[PDB]
Structure formats: structure tokens, C-alpha cells
Design a protein. Structure first.
Lengths: 354, 354, 354, 354
């Protein structure tokens, strides 16, 4: 009745632990993973303690799997179903849900439970709260390596594009093309952007940017970002800027390149610094109408259902994000380490457990 | 001097007339057409008198052309510049512009001047009010047959999708696939729709729908729409429905297939009837939260610039709308009549003057 | 273990009956009523069968009360708590709630459960589903006759003003000034309306209208509404119109008085007709940008909490809506009858049980 | 036909100078001022060189006056008209106006022309560009000391409340109660806020705050702002926060007291510092969904007409902002200096010219 899981032992230390296999509440489900993917979040969780001290916590929160047990009141999911599990699995009966922000259901960022306040998906099984509200059915027609890009990568990048308030034909710059960065680009093509400028530090995975809708690549090795983008837009700037990675000073770049009345949409997790700087003069001394938004990705069944459809109806192919495919539980560790030691060919690895 | 122009002589009669070539005021410009396209709107105007009697009114309101004269205070356009002229050319200094509705600058629909309250583009020359605000430069790289779909077809169909409040992955139905309908399909793809259900009466121009993003074709000859669309969506309905053509009874269809909280976005010109019917029960007896919108397409310099970019950055290829291309002024009549009797191969015709 | 309740016996007949006292599930609460109100809704249900046949269904859905029993998992409400019970008490775990429409949680209007799919509040006890999500604590400082205006009247009227997209200083027309209409008048004042024109059939309850913020009274006995409003507004029309009562043709009137780009917000229950008429010409032949909205009122704890604060912080005093106050269970029968055959002094009656 | 005007001679020195009376262009008007008011902005321009060096620039930008000359094309305004002149008088024919941001018509803050790129209202005459778009008629029934609060104070404060996305019953904090702060309080009551917490530096002009709708006063002398507001709102924070004054660090306070999903609405001119700090942990490390907005107040004819109606229909009485009334041109110098330091509980002065 036991299970192995790849865990954070303490800040700096990871290892395999072994626990009682979890029991579902009346509304929850127990899922075994079919594919999983590690993210930079887990590294900052373990090695920089970006979310504080943790002890013997199974890592990972991007998984698609097979439901194996359901509580007595779970009505839409039965043992055997292939499901897509959003990284964010909020508690759906809170006053924040009545306000429309499920990401923060029960506290700030509290919709994010995996490898934060509960054991994550890097185990033989994991626990999904409120199955009927927090799982989506996975069509057979969608491959696992593509599906596992939906729980975080796709929903975050697309949320960047949602937050940017893009108008048809607007010119959009994307700052940082990690895997989320690339999805922000597809997210902008999905909101009808015209010109899409992808800005990356070397090494640039250019083909991926162009594939997902980029019209220009800006490489920081060719000069400051603000200068490159102003020159491309003949001084007008961009209608929106999506921040999908970088240091705190990238926020000032965003304000500096967005035209008045445009929007800076941040989806990046800033791990260091006490304040994120907003430049005074380039924010109009507070009046340039440059709206700044910054949000955690949506989770829950509906968001997953809606992005699955984007994948199924051939609107976006997230499989080009997957640069490494491993098989078998032992490789979960190997894949985890690839995210620390950042190589050159790497976007995102996927471990298929089958 | 004089000019040739194809006019509505009176309700029921069209023919070529002769006028003084119009002169520009200090802010206007005179354009001669390079390519023009006729629209059904002119048909409802001439043969159904949908806007009342007119006498010797040059018809047509879709053109790209060559500036030949400009007023003393026009700053961005010179004789010789190739320009895209939007169907809607409003007066930009009215209280309706400060309210955010330039389409109704000076009264309901008053932003639409060509072949409504001023002579249209089916002449050797025509008058564009407020040149710097109402003309867009045409890049050499964009062909004329494709560029002339921007003044009405592209801006209207897209406006249908803008009004529909489309969310990423939403399911969208498009009712009526004329040229405008087809652009509503492209617009829905541009707002990130997943499944897009295109509904037409036979003959369905299927290849065009599929090309611009349709995932399903509903043929009215196969049974009532509502029954077909419910069966496609396993009873759930659609998140939005864009009306781009049909009789008044199509407004009820839209309401019957949209789920509660969905949006019916109308861009169709209803030419006959006293009422457009809203079915009481399926509008929840006034409480289903099915919002209905109906709007004239945006025009002006910025709208055209933003859609030109959508063509330019390979977002939408509107050239597949153009099913008939003729050359020479004489053929304006031939093309105009093509819009009266609707044959089967016809989506949109274009007359090139060169 | 029985209880008396005032019920719809069958279509056409009401009477006091005796039922099993309800039991709460682990998430439910049992409330005894402290004050109740009858609604027109109950009339259309009983005598016109608006929601079909029913047998022994306790009527009524506006109550403030005292919790007497709670399920094992209720955390925020205990036996003894005075609470405001919203008319809409939805199931909070549905895909419609993730879409943002709890009113339609599980189907159209399904957030409306009382005297629809479950026994209403005209009993010695009634059952509130999901107490932690669907009850609000009632401060002692708020009188019961005012509090019982919050479950439907205040939230429906205010929803009318929320939907109208009222801008600061906008001119708002409210069509029909019953209790809901009067709260829409106050709703338009709370959203910053300047001029607020109240339109009523005789006898006009003017004093309440002016008291809730109306600046003009239009009496229909003095002539057609459309002609009256145009003369008041020097031909310009109104920025928004809230429909809070009338026949189906009041929709067509609303469209005729709203300026282009304005909004028609409906909160009225339309009981007869196959269609609600939208006039084609005055709706711009489908292009006047006159947006039409029609929605059921919000419910749940957060909606109630927020209106409770509006009364508590002296933003709105709903008591002037209450024209008849009785004491004792017996007078629920008398109050119900007042809703049919509506006399001249009557807005809304309240029965206090104490 | 010369005129004297109160000018910024250079950084640090002001004085009465002599200039040619300005002439109107064909669309412009010349106004003589009837009442005027100085603002802190002119101080930051004069003594801190906030907009760089200027020479012989007439100051001041809040005035209501009398039309004395009109251009050949002015159609809605004649010599003799009482007009309210908004601080922002933008050029209405730029692509930034088509995007919906007239404050930035022609560049960042470029809708603000008075005492920036043209002579301000502290002269015997001043020049209003594009009269038909930038003047509103002033009813006799509105007193001058009240009317002159509309060009800047009322429109700025209300814009703070417009930007905050306030929901009916929401809890709103206003940080800083200068004159703008007080209008922001009135703005939050006009968007239907329930609880309104006004936060000020000592000494608090309390009576004004309560008059415009404040329900709680927070004094910084009783402890840090963050600590107090958490205590008042039992840990939940406020749904929105309007910044109407303070140093750069007040932005961090704002982020710290607003709940996840709330909005920080800034209308303050931040004059010093290189960065405005957004605190990382309280901004969700980039994901708390705390939207930050910052905007220049709206201008133009319609904005003024709409605030005039709010005053006219007794929705807001701004005269309580007017604490000092002086008479005569000579007193323009005296009134200007009151704005350079903390004088009294009174603050904002008005000069009546009659
Ligand atoms: Zn992640
Ligand atoms: Zn047409
Ligand atoms: Zn009710
Ligand atoms: Zn000022």
C-alpha cells in the first residue's frame, strides 16, 4: 500500500522518499502519473528556498495521468480515465472564487498546492483535490509529451497574452523565451497580434520562437533591449509587453518599450530582490497609462479543457517545447537535474512512465 | 472638369452619370481608385431602399486607390501614394468620438459615408474626408485584390469576433458564411477560438471556411441548425455565436445555441422586417445572461494600419475571398450585378483599374 | 417531525400544508425565518405555471433568518446566527461557476433554487445548500424589513445597473419602477449616473423614485415614452437604459431611447410572448452598437456581504421600498395575495415572524 | 492689444511679464478667465524643474472663463459663453486618439498643454486649441469656486476611482487626502464603494474626508499604514487602493494592503526617485494579480460635460475643496505661493476675477 516519490529533503538536498499511498476524500481523486515534467520552480524551491523551508516534500507539479481511485462523491471521473492535471488545483469553495480569482483560493497563490503545501506529482501516485472541478479528460488523440506542456507552460504563457490586452494587429514584445516565453508568443498569435518581437539572451532557440509566431528575434548580444526595440518600431514602442523571464531589471525594460496606454503583463516568477523597480520617468511619473499586471496561471478543469481543445483542434502544437524525452521513474531524478545545470539544447524535458 | 461615376439613379435603377470631380477641403484628399469591390449593402440600398431614396449617388464603398490631390493642411499623404481607403471614414471631432464610437460620429451609422450620404468609390475619383485620420498607406508587398478586402470584409468580420468576447479555447459558431462570415471565422481563429462551427445554407463554400479556420461545417439542408449544433456540442451549446448573414429569424437561432453567459455578436445588415426576434424562453425570459451585440465595422487610419499588418505578417490571407477579378471601369456594372443575383461560385468580386 | 409551510398546492391553488422538517447535509444549514417577502415570481409560478406544475412546494424566496442546524462541515455559521439568505443559492462546483455565471450553475437560472426546485422560505424552517458559500452574517444594527430587501430586490436592481456599463455622469433611463426598478435607480446613482430618468405607468410612486436618486419622472399616461425622452434629452437619447418591468414591447422602447453605443440592461422577467421585439431600424439594422444584456441577479455569500455593507455604511436605505409590514406566520398568506391584484400604495410587503 | 501674465521666468523665479495677447486659429478660441487655481504641479515645474527649464511661460492650468474670440470654424462656442476649460486640451486628430488614450495624443502626457508647451491660464487671456472639442458650457447655477474644481481636481480624483475597478460594496482605500484625494473619495462613493478608508498624513482635514464619503480615517501618527489597514479589515485587505499623493514608497504600501486580485490605481505625480518600488513578496513574486494602473486625468469637452452634470444634479459638491477665496488678478501671486508648503488644514485656493 506504499509508494516511492522523488522529494526535496531539505533546502539543498533532494532524494527518493517512501510514503503511505494517499487516500482520497469524498470529492478527491488519486492519480498515477503517465508523463511528468520538471520546472525551474522546483530548483528555486530546493536550492534557493524561493518558497521557504520544506521537509520531505515530493517535487514536481506538471503531470498527465490515469485516475486510479475516486471518492464516493466524484461524479465525472472513474478509475481508468486519462486526465490532464492543472498545476493549480484550488479549493473551489472560498470567497476568492466568488471574486473570480481561483489562483488565490484560500490565500495568495494558494491555488498552487503541488510541491508547495502538498506532495507533488513526482511519485507513483498523487492526490488531486476536488476531482470533478480540478481534472480534465485527455483525448487519446493527444500525445503525452504535448499534453504535459498544458498544466503549467501553456496556461502560464497564454495567461501572459490574456493579461496583455492585445488588440487585433497590435505589436507585442515578449521578454524572455523560456518554455513559458514561447507559449506567450503562441498566446499572442492566439490573440491576433500582428508583429511579435521575441527578445532572448543567448543562446536563442530561434526556430522555436519563429515556429510559435515570432516575426522578429531580438538577441541581447546585439545591444540593449530598449534600443533594439525602439529602432524596430521607429520610436513608437510596442502595444504590449509580456514578461516571461529574467531579473528584476527586466520590468524597467518592459515599461521603457511599451507605448503610452499599453500594457505590461508579467507571468514570471521573480525569485530575488526585495522590490521590482518601476522606472519613474518612463512610467510617465505615474501617468503614462502603462498598466502593469502580474498573475499566476489559471488552473481547474475548465482552463485545462479549453487548452486541450486548442491542442486538439490544431491551434497550437506544444510538442516543440519538449527537447528531452526520458522513460521510467529512475529518470525523474536525471530530468530534475537538467533544469539546474542549464544546458544549450534544453527547453523542457519529459519523463514518460507508461 | 468632369468624371465618370456609377450611380444609383433612384430606388431600382443604376447607371453611369457624370459629375464635377469633387474638390478637397483643407484637410481632405482626392483619390482615384486602383481596385474596387461591390457589396450586398449597395443592393439593399438600390433595390430594397433599405436607407430610403437617393438620386445620382455614386455607389460602392470598398477601394484602394491613388491619391491625386490633397488639401492645404494634409500632412501624411501626397499625390501618388497608394492607399487603402476604409469603408468607414468618420469625422473625428465629434462627441461620439470622445465617447469611443467613431462608427456613429454625427449620428447612427454616420461614420459610413460612401454610398450612404456621399458619393462612393465607383467613380473616376472620390472624396476622402480628413485624410491624415482616414487613409492608410498600402505596402508594395500587399496585392490589390487582397488589399481591397480590408476596407469592409476584413474589418467587419473581425469586428464580429471582437464583439463576441472570445476566450482562449472557446467554441464559436459563425452563422452565414459570405465573405464577411468567412472573415468572422478568421477573426475567431485570431481571438484564439478552439472549435469553430461554420453554418451555411447550400451551397456551402466549404474550402474557404476550412481555410480560414472552421473545424466543422453545418449545412442547413441537413436539418434545423439548433438541433445540429446541439448534437455537435453534446448539448452544451457554443460560447459565442457571430451573425454574419441571414434573415431576421437567424437572431433567434443565435440565441438558441449560445449557452447562458455566452455572447451573440451581430455584424449582419438586416435589410427587411420591423423586428429582429429574440426568443423569450431561450433568452431565459430576460435572465440567461446571453448578451447580444450588433455593430458597424470600425474604420479610420489606425484600423486599416492594424489589419494591413495582419495581412503583412502573414496572419490572414484575405485573397481567397476574391472569386472573380475583372479589369476596367466598364466591368464595375458586371460585378455590381453579380452581387444582386447570387450565383454559386461567388464569394466576393474585385475590379482592377490599374 | 413536521412543520407548517405556505405552499403552491398545484397550478392555481395555494395553502398551508405540513411537511417533514428538512435535514442538512454535511454542507447545508437549516434556517428558521425572521422576516420574509413575497414576489411577483411566485405569482407567475402559481397562477400561470411559469415553471410547470408543482405539488406541495413551499413558496417564497426572500428571507433573513436564524440558523438552527448545520452540517458536520459548516465552518462559518453556527446555530443562533442571524443571516441574510440570498434568493440565488447555487451549487458552487460546476463548470458554469468556473465560467463566471453562478446564476446558471448547472443549467439556465439553476442558481435559483427556492420555490423552483426546492421548498422555499415560507416555512417554519428551510434548507440552505452550502451554508459557508451561501449565507451572510447579518449585523444586528440592520433592521429586518431593510435586510429582507437584499436577497432579491437590491441585488436584482443593482445587477441592472452593473450590466448597463454606466459611466460617470452618464444619463440613465430606468423603465418600470417597482421595487426592482427603484433599486436600479439607486443602482445607477451608485455607479455615478448624472441624470436619472424614471419611467412609470400610473400610479407613479414618485417620492420613492426621487428618493432613490431619480432626477426626472416620465409618466406614460402623458404620452409615448420614446417621444418624451427625446424631448427631455434634446434629441440625444440616453447613455443607458435599465428594464425593470413591462411587457415585451418595452424592449423595443429601450432600444429606441438608447443612443448608439449605449447599453440596454434587462433584469425583468418577461412572462408572455414568443419573441421580445428588437426594432430593426432603431437597432441600426444590426449595427447601432446598442448592446443588449439580460441576466438573473447574483447570489451567494459575497454578493450578500457586499450589499450588506452598502446598507450598513449608509450608502442605500432599502426600507422605503417596504410599504406593508405584517407580523406572524398567518399574514404570509395575506402578503402573498397582495402580490396578485397589485394595489396603488404597494411596492413590497414584509412579514416579520419575531 | 497686449496682455500681462504671471510667468515662470526661469527655474526658481516667477514674476509678472508682458506678452502679446494670443490669437485663435480657425478652430481655437480665446478665453478670458473668470476663476483660476494653482496646483503643486506648477511648484514642481518652477522650483524643481520637473519639466525642464522654461522662460516667460505663463503658469496655471485650472480656470473657467468667458469666450471672447472664436476662430472662423468654431461652431458650438460664441463670444459671451461661460466655459469650463479642462486641464487636458489634447489635439484630437492623432492615432493615439483612435486608440482611446487622448491624454497621450501626440506623446506621453501630451494632452496636457497649459503651462507645459503653451501659456497657461494665469493671464488676461489664454488660448484653447480646438474649442469645439475642448470646451464645455458652464451653467449659471454652478458657482465659480465650484466650477474651477472640475478642470483638474474632480477629473483627476474620479479617474483614480475609474481606474480602480471598484465593485458594488467593495472596500476602497484612498491614500493621501489632498484635494485630488478628496475627489478620489467622492469618486469611490460614485462607483458604489461601501467602506471607504481615507489615509492621510497629519494634520488630517477630517471633516472634508467624511463629507465626501469616507467611513474610516487612518492617521499615520497612530502607526504604519499597512499595520492599521490590516487591523481595520480583519486581515483581508482592501479590494482596491487609490493613490492620490505621497512619496515613491507609498506604492509599496498600496501593494501591501490590497488583496490578491485587487487594483492599485495611482493618479499621483511622483516627482522624485529613479524607481517606484513594487514589493516582490507582497506582489506575489510577480503573480498576486494585483493590477497597477497609473493615469493622467481625462480632458476634452465630454469629460467636462459629464462632470458638470454630476455637480448639476447634486451628485458631488466640490466647493468644500475651496478653502481660500481671493479676488482679483493681483492675488494670483499670493495664491501660487500657498501651494509650495504645508500652510493650514485648508490647502486648495481659488482666485475669482469677476
Ligand atoms: Zn512549473
Ligand atoms: Zn458592403
Ligand atoms: Zn425572489
Ligand atoms: Zn494641478
Amino acid at each position: 500500500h506504499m509508494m516511492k516519490g522523488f522529494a526535496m529533503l531539505s533546502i539543498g538536498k533532494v532524494g527518493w522518499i517512501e510514503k503511505e499511498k494517499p487516500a482520497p476524500g469524498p470529492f478527491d481523486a488519486i492519480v498515477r502519473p503517465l508523463a511528468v515534467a520538471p520546472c525551474t520552480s522546483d530548483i528555486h524551491t530546493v536550492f534557493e528556498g524561493a518558497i521557504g523551508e520544506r521537509h520531505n516534500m515530493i517535487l514536481g507539479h506538471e503531470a498527465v495521468g490515469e485516475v486510479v481511485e475516486v471518492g464516493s462523491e466524484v461524479k465525472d471521473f472513474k478509475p481508468g480515465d486519462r486526465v490532464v492535471v492543472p498545476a493549480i488545483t484550488p479549493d473551489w469553495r472560498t470567497s476568492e472564487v466568488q471574486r473570480g480569482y481561483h489562483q488565490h483560493s484560500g490565500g495568495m497563490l494558494a491555488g498552487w498546492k503541488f510541491s508547495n503545501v502538498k506532495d507533488g506529482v513526482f511519485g507513483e501516485f498523487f492526490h488531486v483535490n476536488d476531482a470533478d472541478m480540478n481534472l480534465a479528460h485527455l483525448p487519446k488523440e493527444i500525445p503525452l509529451e504535448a499534453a504535459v506542456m498544458i498544466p503549467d507552460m501553456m496556461t502560464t504563457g497564454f495567461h501572459g497574452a490574456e493579461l496583455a490586452d492585445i488588440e487585433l494587429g497590435a505589436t507585442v514584445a515578449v521578454l524572455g523565451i523560456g518554455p513559458v516565453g514561447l507559449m506567450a508568443v503562441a498566446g499572442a498569435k492566439l490573440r491576433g497580434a500582428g508583429r511579435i518581437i521575441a527578445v532572448s539572451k543567448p543562446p536563442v532557440c530561434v526556430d522555436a520562437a519563429k515556429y510559435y509566431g515570432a516575426t522578429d528575434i531580438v538577441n541581447v548580444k546585439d545591444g540593449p533591449i530598449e534600443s533594439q526595440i525602439m529602432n524596430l518600431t521607429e520610436g513608437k514602442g510596442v502595444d504590449a509587453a509580456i514578461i516571461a523571464g529574467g531579473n528584476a531589471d527586466i520590468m524597467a525594460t518592459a515599461v521603457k518599450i511599451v507605448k503610452p496606454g499599453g500594457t505590461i503583463a508579467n507571468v514570471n516568477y521573480f525569485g530575488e530582490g526585495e522590490v521590482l523597480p518601476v522606472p519613474r520617468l518612463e512610467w510617465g511619473c505615474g501617468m503614462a497609462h502603462k498598466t502593469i499586471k502580474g498573475g499566476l496561471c489559471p488552473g481547474g478543469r475548465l482552463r485545462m479543457e479549453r487548452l486541450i481543445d486548442l491542442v486538439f483542434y490544431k491551434r497550437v502544437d506544444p510538442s516543440k517545447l519538449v527537447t528531452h524525452v526520458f522513460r521510467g521513474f529512475d529518470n525523474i531524478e536525471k530530468a530534475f537535474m537538467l533544469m539546474k545545470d542549464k544546458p544549450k539544447d534544453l527547453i523542457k524535458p519529459v519523463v514518460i512512465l507508461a
